[PDB]
């Protein structure tokens, strides 16, 4: 704003990017550990179901390629679809993300 009016300068430009909204979900570790859910199972569930984790490699027509693992484009889209992913606790049942996050 201070440099757009200086007449000795032309086409001053940011080389970065103007910043985005970011959805920071608050994992409550207390209620997650109080319902029996382990704290590494939630990390693995979020990382695989959102971040397309890397597992191993496969061969197709003589050239080795890799294998990714990510949730479908339907249950990954908007913050209403955070509630769909379910995490198994230490008892044996399934615990939802919207109960403790």
Partner 1 sequence: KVNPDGSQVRLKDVADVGLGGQDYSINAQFNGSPASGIAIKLATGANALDT
Partner 2 sequence: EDLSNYIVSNIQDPLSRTKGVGDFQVFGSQYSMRIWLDPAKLNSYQLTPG
Partner 3 sequence: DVSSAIQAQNVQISSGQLGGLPAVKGQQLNATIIGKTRLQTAEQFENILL
Q: For binding to partner 1 (CB under 8 A), which residues are involved? A: 60, 65-66, 68, 72
Question: Rounded to the nearest whole angstrom, what is the least distance from the CB of residue 76 to partner 3 in the complex?
Answer: 7
Produce one character per residue of 40-56: b if its CB has 16 or more CB atoms within 10 Å, e if not: eebeebbebbeeeeeee
Among 7, 14, 16, 79, binds partner 3 (CB under 8 A): 79
27 binds, among partner 3, partner 1, partner 2, none (CB under 5 to 8 A by kind): partner 3
Cα–Cα dist 71/94, whole Å: 17
Q: Judged by CB under 8 A, which stretch of 4-12, 22-30, 56-64, 89-97 contacts partner 3?
A: 22-30
* Kind of pairing between the strands at 94-96 and 86-88: antiparallel
Q: 41, 88 in Cβ contact below 8 A?
A: yes
- Chain residues in the site for partner 3 (CB under 8 A): 20-25, 27, 29-30, 33, 39-40, 43, 46-47, 49-53, 73-74, 76-79
């Amino acid at each position: 704003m201070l440099a757009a009016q200086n007449p000795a300068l032309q086409r001053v430009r940011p080389n970065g990017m103007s910043d985005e909204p970011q959805y920071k979900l608050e994992i409550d570790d207390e209620k997650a550990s109080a319902l029996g859910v382990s704290l590494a199972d939630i990390n693995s569930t979020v990382s695989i179901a959102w971040g397309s984790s890397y597992v191993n490699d496969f061969i197709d027509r003589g050239r080795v390629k890799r294998v990714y693992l990510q949730g479908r484009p339907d249950a990954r889209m908007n913050p209403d679809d955070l509630s769909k992913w379910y995490v198994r606790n230490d008892k044996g049942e399934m615990v939802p993300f919207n109960a403790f996050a």
